[PDB]
């Protein structure tokens, strides 16, 4: 539900998935992230490799890396 708030906050087109563009705009708030670094983290969370981060892949990544959250 707190993971649900951050996900919906950055899913700006309301399609239920996080694209590279929306993840880049999301990472622009935390600080400065190079284009090669956002590509790496997109490929780490995108388990099925379809080009998007759905909500199940996001919550699966969070409670598997509690040190990151």
């Amino acid at each position, epitope marked *: 539900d707190d993971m649900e708030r951050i996900f919906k906050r950055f899913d700006t087109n309301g399609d239920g998935k996080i*694209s590279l563009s929306e993840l880049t705009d999301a990472l622009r708030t935390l600080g400065s992230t190079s284009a090669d670094e956002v*590509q790496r983290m997109m490929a780490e969370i995108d388990t099925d490799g379809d*080009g998007f981060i759905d909500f199940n892949e996001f919550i699966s990544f969070c409670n598997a890396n509690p040190g990151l959250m």
Partner: antibody, heavy 121, light 112 residues
């Protein structure tokens, strides 16, 4: 300047196995996933699997029934494809491709020259 | 349908225009996945021609243009040249199969 160089051609017998390599250069190897695609003679492109170069977790197509395995070597920037229990239906060219995210998805932007595998008598 | 359907072959005189269709289904095009096009010239590996319905990488002229509906996609090639002869594949992601799918490919012949 992104380039994927694959190993040469291989000939195997029905039941043997084969390993094909795919060396990457010209970019950060551990920041992009590598996909494997095969093309049988007179057939369409067939997706084999995906491997995260960093983790390195894999994702295989169920059309192989656990017969294919992907592996990676970050120190050499090379991904390997092993296909056991070979049969004549596996006779194909095997390409490796890099997944590159764009604004609204991901694409296979760079391909390797391909490696011919022939499972003959 | 969880597969991409293409016409087997297209042909046209040098300088003319051809179109290559690619129909999908609710689990691929209808699921919000863009279509990519790849060009496989004779005796080479596939090359990225169109990504994201109608974006061209550096090196592809505007003679190649793509379109996409929620269920169909098309690849337009204007001003045919002899160097365009080869095979063309569309590509998308199917969510029911949870994998990448390619069309059967279309052999484009430039009439000589």
């Amino acid at each position: 300047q992104v380039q994927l160089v694959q190993s040469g051609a291989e000939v195997r017998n029905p039941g043997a196995s084969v390993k094909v390599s795919c060396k990457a250069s010209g970019y950060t190897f551990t920041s992009y996933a590598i996909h494997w695609v095969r093309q049988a003679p007179g057939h369409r492109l067939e997706w084999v699997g995906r491997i995260n170069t960093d983790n390195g977790n894999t994702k295989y197509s169920q059309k192989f029934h656990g017969r294919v395995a992907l592996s990676r070597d970050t120190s050499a920037s090379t991904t390997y494809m092993d296909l056991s229990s070979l049969n004549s239906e596996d006779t194909a060219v095997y390409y490796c491709a890099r997944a590159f995210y764009y604004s609204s998805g991901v694409m296979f932007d760079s391909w390797g020259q391909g490696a011919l595998v022939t499972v003959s008598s | 349908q969880s597969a991409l359907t293409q016409p087997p072959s297209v042909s046209g005189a040098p300088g003319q225009r051809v179109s290559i269709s690619c129909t999908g289904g609710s689990s691929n095009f209808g699921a919000g996945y863009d279509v990519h096009w790849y060009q496989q010239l004779p005796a080479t590996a596939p090359k990225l021609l169109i990504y994201g319905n109608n974006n061209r990488p550096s090196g592809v002229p505007d003679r190649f243009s793509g379109s996409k509906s929620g269920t169909s996609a098309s690849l337009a090639i204007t001003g045919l040249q002899a160097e365009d002869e080869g095979d063309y594949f569309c590509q998308s992601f199917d969510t029911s199969l949870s994998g990448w799918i390619f069309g059967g490919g279309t052999k484009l012949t430039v009439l000589g």
